[PDB]
């Protein structure tokens with residue numbers, strides 16, 4: 001039913017190498033050249049990628065910031081409330097960002113907070129302003 | 134083993150009747166399965182009897198005595214079976230002391246052309262049957278293509294050497310009948326390149342398996358893809374080996390392409406991700422600046438100023454989270470690219486060194502078929518491979534010449550008698566022969582039938598070495614051009630000191646180039662005497678016949694010198710170099726299934742010729758011209774046993790037409 005293993009005798013390939021007297025060495029060098037093309041291409045991106053690597057030297061260690069470890073509280077100080085209204089104004093609804101900004105209240109409180117202080121801080125009016133941008 | 138062993142040893146199914154036997158015994162085959170089994174046993178038995186002692190005639194009575202009941206109840210059937218076996222050379226063939234001596238008065242006159250093994254086999258059989266046999270020989274010796282060189286103790290077959298296995302081989306019988314020094318072949322063959330350095334086991338084994346894998350490939354092309362005709366021409370075997378090597382070479386390239394195309398596909402996933410990392414670092418760089426500027430405003434600050442420091446801090450650690458995720462990913466791609474660079478696929482399908490060694494495997498094929506692989510039929514070249522005898526091929530130590538010479542004991546053999554014209558008519562035949570030494574002395578022979586064992590190369594000769602009157606019908610002449618008669622030659626190197634490995638019978642030499650793959654590519658140590666024997670196969674064969682013995686012998690020493698060191702190669706004492714295509718009594722070595730030919734052409738060769746009626750309106754006559762020889766036996770061509778079987782075959786068919794076949798009632 002099928003050829004010996006490793007032998008790759010397609011029904012369609014034989015005709016292509018049998019089509020003409022020099023057809024065999026045609027297809028065989030049509031690929032000899034195509035291989036070179038990829039090799040050429042590999043060097044290029046290997047250079048381009050190598051150049052980009054150099055630019056990233058230093059990584060971002062110098063631009064890194066120490067992490068704050070502050071115990072989440074549950075009381076809203078007048079300050080924290082104010083941080084909040086601004087965070088909504090600049091984030092809109094990204095719960096994590098707003099919790100990250102206050103860095104003491106959490107996403108549940110933050111999420112709760114909109115409905116608690118709702119008419120009081122005009123959050124709906126604020127949120128429309130965020131969506132404008 | 135048993136009775137059944139004798140059927141196998143006679144090339145016969147032990148449990149079914151052959152088409153042969155259906156012809157002689159149609160009552161049995163069309164009859165009840167019980168009688169068939171009786172018959173079959175009677176046959177199988179009788180075969181046994183002959184085989185266990187093949188040095189004495191097996192008379193019908195002898196058979197009946199040893200046969201037992203209930204099988205020995207129907208004497209006619211036993212007599213019917215034994216005659217059939219005897220007629221067609223399955224028993225009482227070869228060289229045997231006969232119990233009942235030859236009838237003093239013979240019936241019929243048969244001229245046999247050629248004292249080759251087919252010829253003598255028929256001759257012995259016909260004489261055996263009470264016919265008047267005479268063989269016409271062009272040569273001054275019998276055996277034809279069984280030639281043996283002899284000088285002092287030096288002995289080396291220029292002709293056949295090998296008995297291919299005794300499982301079912303009539304030569305098995307003959308060897309018991311004539312003492313034949315039958316020595317086995319140790320298959321181990323070490324290959325030596327042009328430098329004279331042996332090829333290492335790694336390499337030898339890896340190229341041999343490719344070679345077989347390559348054949349297995351051509352078979353697949355022929356049968357499953359039906360790649361048999363190309364450009365309105367039959368596909369040769371060699372053609373299809375090119376097309377298979379090319380396709381395996383293409384695949385090598387294909388897989389290199391696909392593999393590097395999988396590096397570019399990843400280097401470009403890296404380059405695109407590097408871009409994002411470089412654009413994010415700049416964004417981070419300027420964020421930091423903004424945060425520090427925002428952090429510079431010392432407290433106490435109003436909340437919009439506090440929000441800004443917190444907002445910038447949150448954002449910047451967010452981007453520092455992206456750039457960390459995007460450099461874990463860069464690590465994965467960097468290692469993934471590293472794997473791909475280390476697992477590159479095979480650089481080449483085969484190296485120049487590798488493919489030079491591959492050639493030596495094609496030279497072997499060329500030497501087996503005595504022809505360039507471009508002439509072999511793809512579809513049919515191995516058609517005779519089912520009927521291989523079992524057992525390991527042997528060589529004849531005292532020369533193969535002894536068989537032929539032993540078959541000529543008691544035969545009317547005119548040597549130095551070159552047949553030039555065969556004339557065959559409704560009423561009989563006459564063959565015209567000259568004396569080879571003085572071509573003018575002319576001979577006329579009359580006979581009831583001619584058996585022609587002229588080699589196929591002789592028959593192919595234009596202009597004709599032998600003319601037939603009337604000419605052979607085209608159906609015969611066409612099968613003659615269609616068929617292939619090829620070439621291989623031998624060089625016999627005779628030396629006083631054995632300076633090679635005496636425990637290896639054969640060892641190769643890898644030719645420098647493909648076009649010279651068969652020039653002395655194989656050497657044989659077969660003999661008690663110190664003789665190495667060099668083969669010239671493929672294209673080399675036809676070419677080396679235009680070159681001197683000395684020049685040919687030189688290239689022999691050279692190669693031997695290279696594999697053993699200039700020091701240990703003494704000048705050969707006696708040199709003989711065959712030139713079979715040149716020989717006009719052979720004009721070749723043996724037949725091969727040419728491209729465009731088939732196994733049916735051998736069948737064609739063996740159908741005999743019936744001439745036209747002398748007086749128009751007379752009844753359709755008897756056939757008068759019969760053909761034997763290795764080119765007539767489709768299942769066992771180009772072999773001494775095939776020749777022999779064809780002589781046995783025609784003898785029985787000639788006996789049946791002129792002595793009548795009484796075993797059919």
Ligand SMILES: Cc1nnc(NC(=O)c2cccc([C@H]3C[C@@H]3NC3CCC3)c2)s1
Nearest residue numbers: 500501502514515516517518770771772
């Ligand atoms: C181990 C081995 N097993 N067999 C080995 N030798 C051969 O089969 C052989 C060698 C030379 C010539 C012929 C000729 C009878 C062949 N006609 C052609 C080739 C097959 C159809 C056969 S090598």
